[PDB]
């Protein structure tokens, strides 16, 4: 109504997004989040942007999850609005892991930033990538505060990272996957 609040167990919002080609569908094609979900296979959805350090710091660990589990689970990176958009002048005095991105003007800018991200962090095609639409519908529906992971299973939210200081933890996602595939 006036605000959204998603929780564990609820139906996963079928947000509108745009494909970002990640070759080994047409680049920029419109699609929906649940287009990437299949049978009882978990879909691990990782929301963030290049200027969000908690997100980029764990992108290598995300890549490893994709490598270890893509035969049994699907992976989707949803590129949202920049956490810390650049103004182009100030020089990060520390060498930083990720790269600067200015505030997106349009969908093309957001898709371009996702293309930059995929190259910088060596994400493989099995890590499917989309960009949120410019109305930020996926960001708002999934309650993302700069970065979040949601695992969708059987059309419902099976895992939803919390709001604590260290709630964004891809090794907790690893644990979920280990449990799901264990006897």
Numbering used by the authors: 70 to 93, 103 to 261
How is this structure described in the published paper?
Iodothyronine deiodinases (Dio) are selenocysteine-containing membrane enzymes that activate and inactivate the thyroid hormones (TH) through reductive iodide eliminations. The three deiodinase isoforms are homodimers sharing highly conserved amino acid sequences, but they differ in their regioselectivities for the deiodination reaction and regulatory features. Dios feature homologous transmembrane regions and catalytic domains with a catalytic selenocysteine (Sec) residue essential for their unique reductive deiodination mechanism. The Dio isoforms differ, however, in their regioselectivities: Dio1 can catalyze deiodination of both the inner (tyrosyl) and the outer (phenolic) ring, while Dio2 targets only the outer ring and Dio3 only the inner ring.
To explore the molecular basis of deiodinase isoform differences, we solved a crystal structure of the catalytic domain of Mus musculus Dio2 (mDio2cat; residues 71–262). The catalytic Sec130 was replaced with cysteine to simplify bacterial overexpression. The protein mDio2cat-(Lys180Ala-Lys181Ala; mDio2cat-AlaAla) indeed formed well-diffracting crystals and the structure of mDio2cat-AlaAla (from now on referred to as mDio2cat) could be solved and refined at a resolution of 1.1 Å to R/Rfree values of 14.5% and 16.9%, respectively. The mDio2cat structure comprises 183 residues, covering an N-terminal Gly as a cloning artifact, a small part of the linker to the transmembrane region (71–76), and the complete catalytic core (77–261), except for the C-terminal Arg262 and residues 94–102, which are not defined by electron density. All residues of the structure are within favored (96.5%) or allowed regions (2.9%) of the Ramachandran plot, except for Phe224, which is well defined by electron density. mDio2cat features a Trx/Prx fold with deiodinase-specific modifications and insertions and high similarity in the overall structure to mDio3cat, confirming the proposed conservation of a Trx/Prx-related fold among the Dio isoforms. The basic Trx fold provides β-strands β1–4, and the sheet they form is extended by a single strand, βD, from the deiodinase-specific insertion that further comprises an α-helix αD and the extended loop-D (residues 161–188), which protrudes out of the globular structure. A major difference between Dio2 and other isoforms, however, is a 15-residue (91–105) “Dio2-insertion” in the N-terminal region of the catalytic core. Interestingly, there is no electron density for nine central residues of the Dio2-insertion (94–102), indicating conformational heterogeneity or high flexibility.
